[PDB]
Swiss-Prot record, chain A:
Phenotype when changing E84G: Confers resistance to pyrophosphate analog PFA
Chain coiled-coil ranges: none
Stated consequence of mutating W83S: Confers resistance to pyrophosphate analog PFA
Effect recorded for V70L: Confers resistance to HBY 097
UniProt name for this protein: p51 RT
Result, substituting L263I: Confers resistance to delavirdine, efavirenz and nevirapine
Impact upon substituting F111Y: Confers multi-NRTI resistance
Gene behind this protein: gag-pol
Effect of Y176C: Confers multi-NNRTI resistance
Residues covered by the Reverse transcriptase domain: 39-214
Impact after mutating Y110F: Confers resistance to abacavir
UniProt effect for mutating F72L: Confers multi-NRTI resistance
Length: 404, 558
């Protein structure tokens, strides 16, 4: 028996265009889909289905096996009411508190659940061909599809049964499902944690479902960092008031008046200066001020999260997550044969996964790259079974330094 | 004509909508006669069927005579039905490019006859297609018919036909993996690697398979012969090219003649290397009427002559060998124009192309070169399924220096330097640290939003000072002027401090070309210097120097 899905009033299905794929990814998808069809998961469709969702092939995480990845970003936006405020899945505040969090793929669960017949058409996707030689191969889902937020929403009750014995027996373990994954957190010693995971994989396995470790409770600050120096220049002070000046307005209670006064008249940049010690009280007040949270900044569940990334150089990247500019809920860095696209893809994924753990939602990324570049390349390094929303930007000169 | 046995595509109107009910306009007796003849004939053939007055739908019919001829044709205005019919999936998503065609020993072109008429229409949809041949003037109920096949001009036809021809060809494509079939509109392109023997024969079992399905195709003697003229190309058996390009010699050129010209050149650009179109397009800017005459510019003339020369003599392209690799070569042609060639074997091109693009306001050859590489990469994937190996006119160190320091993430696939001038380079670099014993200009710009009047100046630390007035400017324009100023009065080494993130941003990207002459004037300057350092500070923050240029330029402006 299927549960009925209704697109949000007024919206129609997704008519997203299929990006071009290389011969190898196409062949890989043709095999994969040829098998799913035999197993009855999907069925070829007709011209009478105007809908479309992009599809890709990824090589997963440290794997040699091609995995199919469907991009339901658009379908998810249009079904948002069903999976979020109708069949919602509560996010556990305790998760980020755990010493160890293991992420498990649970996506094969959905294949044993049929999709409401009236909703299938919206899951249309196409396997393109090369040089438009032939028409693409068109298919639609017959079962709960991986990548669609309505799948866990629906599968919720069955996951609940599957996990009840493991839950009853280990009351201090937190299990959270976000999309195709299970997040399992514990405060157990690492050998006992890994042991409990194995135990959980056995339960999963009796129901058909066949990991990698985070340490949330060790996730810390990337405080705006002011320099510690001997013999300052106008240049360094200027830079200092600059950084200092921006850090304020974002940081509640910063001061610089002491600092400005040293910068008086028009003196060469390369001119050293003696520091007045009260300026030093600010240095230490702000410094001590900076090494703290923000105060006043709280996550609002009703608002979208945003993530900005800056390329620092040397395989180093910075980021901030916020709902209102300068009101950073979190900040961090990601560090690396990796080109920028690869490294950027890796940061995007790391930030996204922390974001799922802390808030149960993915951020909308502002990526310092060219759409086309990003578009042709990301799939080469993507390993996650989800895809966050993104948009392209041009990092502001200042922003980057202020975050180094 | 056979009407395919094939299954039917269920079809629907758009949610909340009912079929058309448009009134037939009274027709001339000759027109009514013409249609009655055409309709009785179509009904004889199964194509249409007579109905009653119980069906309440109607679409208008019309009868168009002939130019030169004495035959008649029936036109059905399916606009209303179309606007109520559900949307279908897109027919084709691109067209094949010949450079992507793999060479085959033998290829034959088969065109399905009466294509739409050879395929049945969803039984429950037939009603919505009702039409009426009106009777002589008012009097008498008209003759009502409805379609059984896909009607010419209806929204779902192209799609339904293609789906049908996909379902029908499948079987044969199973038991014939080694044969290539291209489906394009109502054509079939069939190629194999056999000896005419099992080919002329294989093409016969194919036709046969199609007849079992209601689909008639040409037979030898009627079957098209090579070179195939198709879609603007000439497909010979070992090469391809664009169809004859003739450039008009003309006294006066009108906007319409240049547009057509530019168009032919762009089409020729896929196989003729070096075609340039910039100077000719400039003439099309802001343009007047289609018939207005435009005096060729000297640059436009030199561009033209250069093009005729490239085009004097023919050029062809080769087909694709899946085993060899793809090499893409690019060259800077000038004024933001690039050209490339793609080959597998040195100098036997599969294709060519050009990249102009102005991705931004201010840019440089390094960003341009990488935009071109992206465009070509995307293109390769589309045509060949894989990326090419590049041979670029940029030294591997210039690239590394640039990529490394730039704020944005970039990434050129596998490439190699090839020394074909003009070579791509950066014309200046900003110091990373303040130049000792060089003058520090503290610059500033301000403009009255009200009068649009501005002042731009600098106060150095070597005592110097200056302030220029500007008339219809902006804060952006005054802030860039102040920098230019500082660069004019400073000599080989300068430290410049601004509170303009905007001018900072522009400059830190090493632009070498801009839409703003002011910006180009600054460029000319930046290149003349030995060393320039540039720094930024907040504004209206009594910063030594800032509050001083700030008071100078504020006065008389705000
Ligand atoms: N008209 C037309 C037309 C349009 C397309 Cl898009 C494809 C096509 O067929 C081929 C054309 C092919 O090109 C390479 C080739 N091998 N042998 C040939 N013989 C010719 N007379 C022309 C082209 C080819 C290869 C396979 C095929 Cl089936 C014919």
């Amino acid at each position: 028996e299927t549960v009925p899905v209704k697109l949000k009033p007024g919206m129609d299905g997704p008519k997203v265009k299929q990006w071009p794929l290389t011969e190898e990814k196409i062949k890989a998808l043709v095999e994969i889909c040829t098998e799913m069809e035999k197993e009855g998961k999907i069925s070829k469709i007709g011209p009478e289905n105007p809908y479309n969702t992009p599809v890709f092939a990824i090589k997963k995480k440290d794997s040699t096996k091609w995995r199919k990845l469907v991009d339901f970003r658009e379908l998810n936006k249009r079904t948002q009411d069903f999976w979020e405020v109708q069949l919602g899945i509560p996010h556990p505040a305790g998760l980020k508190k755990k010493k160890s969090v293991t992420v498990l793929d649970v996506g094969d669960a959905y294949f044993s659940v049929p999709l409401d017949e009236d909703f299938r058409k919206y899951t249309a996707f196409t396997i393109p061909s090369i040089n438009n030689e032939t028409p693409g191969i068109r298919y639609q889902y017959n079962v709960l599809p991986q990548g669609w937020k309505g799948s866990p929403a629906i599968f919720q009750s069955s996951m609940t049964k599957i996990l009840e014995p493991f839950r009853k027996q280990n009351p201090d373990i937190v299990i959270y499902q976000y999309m195709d994954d299970l997040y399992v957190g514990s405060d157990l010693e690492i050998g006992q944690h890994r042991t409990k995971i194995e135990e959980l994989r056995q339960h999963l396995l009796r129901w058909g479902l066949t990991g990698y470790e985070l340490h949330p409770d060790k996730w810390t600050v990337q405080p705006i960092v002011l320099p510690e120096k001997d013999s300052w220049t106008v240049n360094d002070i200027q830079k200092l008031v600059g950084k200092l000046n921006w850090a304020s307005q974002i940081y509640p209670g910063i001061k610089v008046r002491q600092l400005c006064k040293l910068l008086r008249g028009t003196k060469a940049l390369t001119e050293v200066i003696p520091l007045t010690e009260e300026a030093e009280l600010e240095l230490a007040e702000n410094r001590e001020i900076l090494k703290e949270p923000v105060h006043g900044v709280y996550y609002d569940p009703s608002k979208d999260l945003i993530a900005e990334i800056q390329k620092q150089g040397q395989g180093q990247w910075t980021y901030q997550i916020y709902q209102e500019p300068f009101k950073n809920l979190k900040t961090g860095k990601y560090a690396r044969h990796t080109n920028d696209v690869k490294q950027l893809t890796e940061a995007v994924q790391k930030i996204t996964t922390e974001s799922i753990v802390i808030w149960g939602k993915t951020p909308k990324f502002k990526l310092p790259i060219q759409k086309e570049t990003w578009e042709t390349w990301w799939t080469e390094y993507w390993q996650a079974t989800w895809i966050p929303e993104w948009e392209f930007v041009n990092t502001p000169p200042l922003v980057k330094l202020w975050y180094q | 004509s056979p009407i395919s046995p094939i299954e039917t595509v269920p079809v629907k109107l758009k949610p909340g909508m009912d079929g058309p009910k448009v009134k037939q306009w009274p027709l001339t007796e000759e027109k009514i006669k013409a249609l009655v003849e055409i309709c009785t004939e179509m009904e004889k053939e199964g194509k249409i069927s007579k109905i009653g007055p119980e069906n309440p739908y109607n679409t208008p019919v019309f009868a168009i005579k002939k130019k030169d001829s004495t035959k008649w044709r029936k036109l059905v205005d399916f606009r209303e039905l179309n606007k109520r019919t559900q949307d279908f999936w897109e027919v084709q998503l691109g067209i094949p490019h010949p450079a992507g065609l793999k060479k085959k020993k033998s290829v034959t072109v088969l065109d399905v006859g009466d294509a739409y008429f050879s395929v049945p229409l969803d039984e429950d949809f037939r009603k919505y297609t009702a039409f009426t041949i009106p009777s002589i003037n008012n009097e008498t109920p008209g003759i009502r018919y409805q379609y059984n096949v896909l009607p010419q001009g209806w929204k779902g036809s192209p799609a339904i036909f293609q789906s049908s021809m996909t379902k029908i060809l499948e079987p044969f494509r199973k038991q014939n993996p080694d044969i290539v079939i291209y489906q394009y509109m109502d054509d079939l392109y069939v190629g194999s690697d056999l000896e005419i023997g099992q080919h002329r024969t294989k093409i016969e079992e194919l036709r046969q398979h199609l007849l079992r399905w209601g689909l008639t195709t040409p037979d030898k003697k009627h079957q098209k012969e090579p070179p195939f003229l198709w879609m603007g190309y000439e497909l010979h058996p070992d090469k391809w090219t664009v169809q004859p390009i003739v450039l008009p010699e003309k006294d006066s050129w009108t906007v319409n003649d240049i547009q057509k010209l530019v168009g032919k050149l762009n089409w020729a650009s896929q196989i003729y290397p070096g075609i340039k179109v910039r100077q000719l397009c400039k003439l099309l800017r802001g343009t007047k009427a289609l018939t207005e005459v435009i005096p060729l510019t000297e640059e436009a003339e030199l561009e033209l002559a250069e093009n005729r020369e490239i085009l004097k003599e023919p050029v062809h392209g080769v087909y694709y060998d899946p085993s060899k690799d793809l090499i893409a070569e690019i060259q800077k042609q000038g004024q933001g124009q690039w050209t490339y060639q793609i080959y597998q074997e040195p100098f036997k091109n599969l294709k060519t192309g050009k990249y102009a693009r102005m991705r931004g306001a201010h840019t440089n050859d390094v960003k341009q070169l990488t935009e071109a590489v992206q465009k070509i990469t995307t293109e390769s994937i589309v045509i060949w399924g894989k990326t090419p190996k590049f041979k670029l006119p940029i030294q591997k160190e210039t690239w590394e220096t640039w990529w490394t320091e730039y704020w944005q993430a970039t990434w050129i696939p596998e490439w190699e330097f090839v020394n074909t001038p003009p070579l791509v380079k950066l014309w200046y670099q900003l110091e990373k640290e303040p130049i000792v014993g060089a003058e520090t200009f503290y610059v500033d710009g301000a403009a009255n939003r009200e009068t649009k009047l501005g002042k731009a100046g600098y106060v150095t630390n070597r005592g110097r000072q200056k302030v220029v007035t500007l008339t219809d400017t902006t804060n952006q324009k005054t802030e860039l002027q102040a920098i230019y100023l500082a660069l004019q009065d400073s000599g080989l080494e300068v430290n410049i401090v601004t509170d303009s993130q905007y001018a900072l941003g522009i400059i830190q990207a090493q632009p070498d070309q801009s839409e703003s002459e002011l910006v180009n004037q600054i460029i000319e300057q930046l290149i003349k210097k030995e060393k320039v350092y540039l720094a930024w500070v907040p504004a209206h923050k009594g910063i030594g120097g800032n509050e001083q240029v700030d008071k100078l330029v504020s006065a008389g402006i705000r």
